[PDB]
Ligand binder design. Structure first.
Ligand SMILES: O=C(O)[C@@H](O)[C@H](O)[C@H](O)COP(=O)(O)O
Ligand SMILES: O=C(O)[C@@H](O)[C@H](O)[C@H](O)COP(=O)(O)O
Ligand code: NI
Ligand code: NI
Lengths: 187, 187
């Protein structure tokens, strides 16, 4: 039986999607992710702020089909490091992804199975192409929420494990009032 | 070898993607698409207007990779029928598509291989899920350009022929100042 086509309203101001399933990631949910463990533990104990929320509209895992989701990435820093999404590779490594930036100032960090990294800046209107085999993470480098829509293959799945253990070969920090992408000492 | 990640600017007011492949379809490229053949002949002679332009960023046709494109669908009528895109099924029938409406007033007409139809209104912010197996055509029901962004599997391909010969089982016309979706009499 064919699936029913539908339309859902996406609010470009809030990132809210009608009919989507919500996910909330708090700072506590990201242990071992930031370089400055002291600032992390401090921020968690003090307020454990929400780092980001995802509104996902997903299908059964089937070749050729597509999922889409917005993310609202809140502004913040853990020590010198800007708030970011956990980041992942796809379970089916060769699945690509397309991001559309809607609001705020941010960017995407990407890296290969081997660690070679790239940084792509994102402002409203920017569409980012995430090629097959690249892990990807988004970072809010500004003062307001960074909101974007992502469209990805239904069967792409997720590999958070690799990233959670080694992180990205680079980190994005504020140094002298400036955003800088630098080597991860933890790597 | 890994492909290079990249970002491109999409302009939400004009639908133009900087550096993208541009395609232009004029009414003369749409012989046998509109119900009112005489009105089609007449409008082509008087003016041969651009019905739509597409700005496409495509990858090689491999499983799991993704293409994206904007379309600028111009306002107009052929007789009583609103300007529309040619419409197609995918070559790999079971490939889905996701559409994001950016500007203007329109909608999508979809139908199964058996001719069952569905109409989904589109205003700015509407995201439409085009399921596996469903042919899809966009229609402009207002007086300004209807602009939207579409993301689709790189291997989906196109099947235009099926629609080129028999059309869609429904049409979208203006009747008594109102938009109406009704049976295609030539189907
Ligand atoms: O599909 C995606 O890759 C995004 O929707 C991310 O899942 C989302 O931004 C949250 O990031 P992560 O999944 O890395 O926690
Ligand atoms: O991926 C899509 O289906 C869209 O980009 C359409 O191709 C585009 O709107 C043009 O319509 P058609 O391809 O039916 O002429
Ligand atoms: Ni992903
Ligand atoms: Ni299509």
């Amino acid at each position: 039986m064919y699936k029913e086509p539908f339309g859902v309203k996406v609010d470009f101001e809030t990132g809210i999607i009608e009919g989507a399933k919500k996910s909330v990631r708090r700072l506590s949910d990201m242990e071992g992710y930031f370089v400055d463990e002291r600032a992390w533990k401090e921020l968690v104990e003090k307020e454990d702020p929400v780092v980001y929320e995802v509104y996902a509209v997903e299908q059964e895992e089937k070749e050729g089909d597509l999922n889409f989701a917005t993310t609202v990435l809140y502004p913040g820093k853990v020590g010198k490091e800007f708030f970011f999404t956990k980041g992942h590779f796809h379970a089916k490594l060769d699945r690509a992804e397309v991001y559309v930036a809607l609001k705020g100032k941010g960017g995407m960090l990407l890296q290969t199975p081997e660690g070679d990294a790239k940084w792509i800046s994102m402002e409203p209107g920017t569409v980012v192409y995430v090629p097959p085999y690249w892990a990807h993470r988004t970072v809010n480098i500004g003062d307001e929420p960074f909101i974007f829509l992502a469209i990805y293959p239904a069967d792409a799945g997720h590999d958070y494990g690799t990233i959670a253990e080694k992180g990205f070969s680079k980190i994005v920090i504020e140094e002298n009032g400036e955003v800088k992408v630098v080597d991860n000492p933890r790597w």
